[PDB]
Ligand binder design. Structure first.
Ligand code: WMT
Length: 337
């Protein structure tokens, strides 16, 4: 088997490997597809020792095999051993992109036209995801891939879940898995992240980061994340506080000194005014007042791209590790000769 840094056993169809980056449970390589005569991306996954890893791998495979959308990366092939006894790793083959938005923002300033086009494609993909009753729950620059002509695709459904708004309520300061800087304020107050507004907040954070090439809320631990959010949004209104019935969460907010809102055009003096208007509506403190994906697509900032007939929706909306390995084996059987 061909080896990189680690067994990367994808031959003989896929040859001439090059290291790219990292997935959750293994590395990502580029390779030559000898059948299709094009280079592809391959992610190695080794989840079978841990139950939670098998959960993350199975649910992502299930979601991506049903999804078909121009702004969501698809699974072209899945490589694994012919038997459950022999399969230790799984390889996911996907289109080879040029970069991810995290790396791009490290060194490239975006024109307003690029910001607009990137945001349009994120929301177009997100409309499809949400139309399937699915939440991505970990949107961030490193999970957005771009090709050489700036077509954008959403990657990593590792933390995705079916929406469950009737069971979203939780206590104050309960732990959360998704990446800190892109967490909506209600995660730290009273939300399990089971509603679609959790994704819109992350997109708002991504928009702000495209405007300035730096994360807008770079919190350095759990409750510090809320410090950063309130430091820019200012203190929540009485009405928004009244929507927080949990006493521990509400009294925490009531204990804070008053904070003024920082105007978006002071933070982003170069930004298009329409982009800042949409940014404000995505980074709304109250999740029930936060703009939804279809409203965001219809916002004037995105007028040159908006076309609901060309923004498709899903046709079909949505355990011991040994049973999960068996389910992963079964879910990947369609790609076997
Ligand atoms: C999803 C992982 C897929 C395999 O990533 C890619 O396809 C991919 C690509 O085609 C080109 C480049 O330059 C990077 C890349 O993935 C980078 C890894 C990414 O930031 C996350 O860690 C992922 O795993 C990704 F969402």
């Amino acid at each position: 088997p061909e080896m990189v840094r680690q067994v990367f056993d994808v031959g003989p169809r896929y040859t001439n490997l090059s290291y790219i980056g990292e997935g959750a449970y293994g590395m990502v390589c580029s390779a030559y597809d000898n059948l299709n005569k094009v280079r592809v991306a391959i992610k190695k996954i080794s989840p079978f020792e841990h139950q939670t890893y098998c959960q993350r791998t199975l649910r992502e495979i299930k979601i991506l095999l049903r999804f078909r959308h121009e702004n969501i990366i698809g699974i072209n092939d899945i490589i694994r051993a012919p038997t459950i006894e022999q399969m230790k790793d799984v390889y996911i083959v996907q289109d080879l992109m040029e970069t991810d938005l995290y790396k791009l923002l490290k060194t490239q300033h975006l024109s307003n036209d690029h910001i607009c086009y990137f945001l349009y494609q994120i929301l177009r993909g997100l409309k499809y995801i949400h139309s399937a009753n699915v939440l991505h729950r970990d949107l961030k620059p490193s999970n957005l891939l771009l090709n050489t002509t700036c077509d954008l695709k959403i990657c990593d459904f590792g933390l995705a879940r079916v929406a469950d708004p009737d069971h979203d309520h939780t206590g104050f300061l309960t732990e959360y898995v998704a990446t800190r800087w892109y967490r909506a304020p209600e995660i730290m107050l009273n939300s399990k992240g089971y509603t679609k507004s959790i994704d819109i907040w992350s997109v708002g954070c991504i928009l702000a980061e495209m405007l300035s090439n730096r994360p807008i809320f770079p919190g350095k631990h759990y409750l510090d994340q809320l410090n950063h959010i309130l430091g820019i949004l200012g203190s929540p209104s009485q009405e928004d506080l009244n929507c927080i019935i949990n006493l521990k969460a509400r009294n925490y907010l009531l204990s804070l000194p008053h904070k003024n809102k920082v105007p978006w055009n002071r933070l982003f003096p170069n930004a298009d005014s329409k982009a800042l208007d949409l940014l404000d509506k995505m980074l709304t403190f109250n999740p029930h007042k936060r703009i939804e994906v279809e409203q965001a697509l219809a916002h004037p900032y995105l007028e040159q791209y908006y076309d609901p007939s060309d923004e498709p929706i899903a046709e079909a909306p949505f355990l011991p590790k040994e049973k999960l390995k068996e389910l992963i084996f079964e879910e990947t059987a369609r790609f076997q000769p």
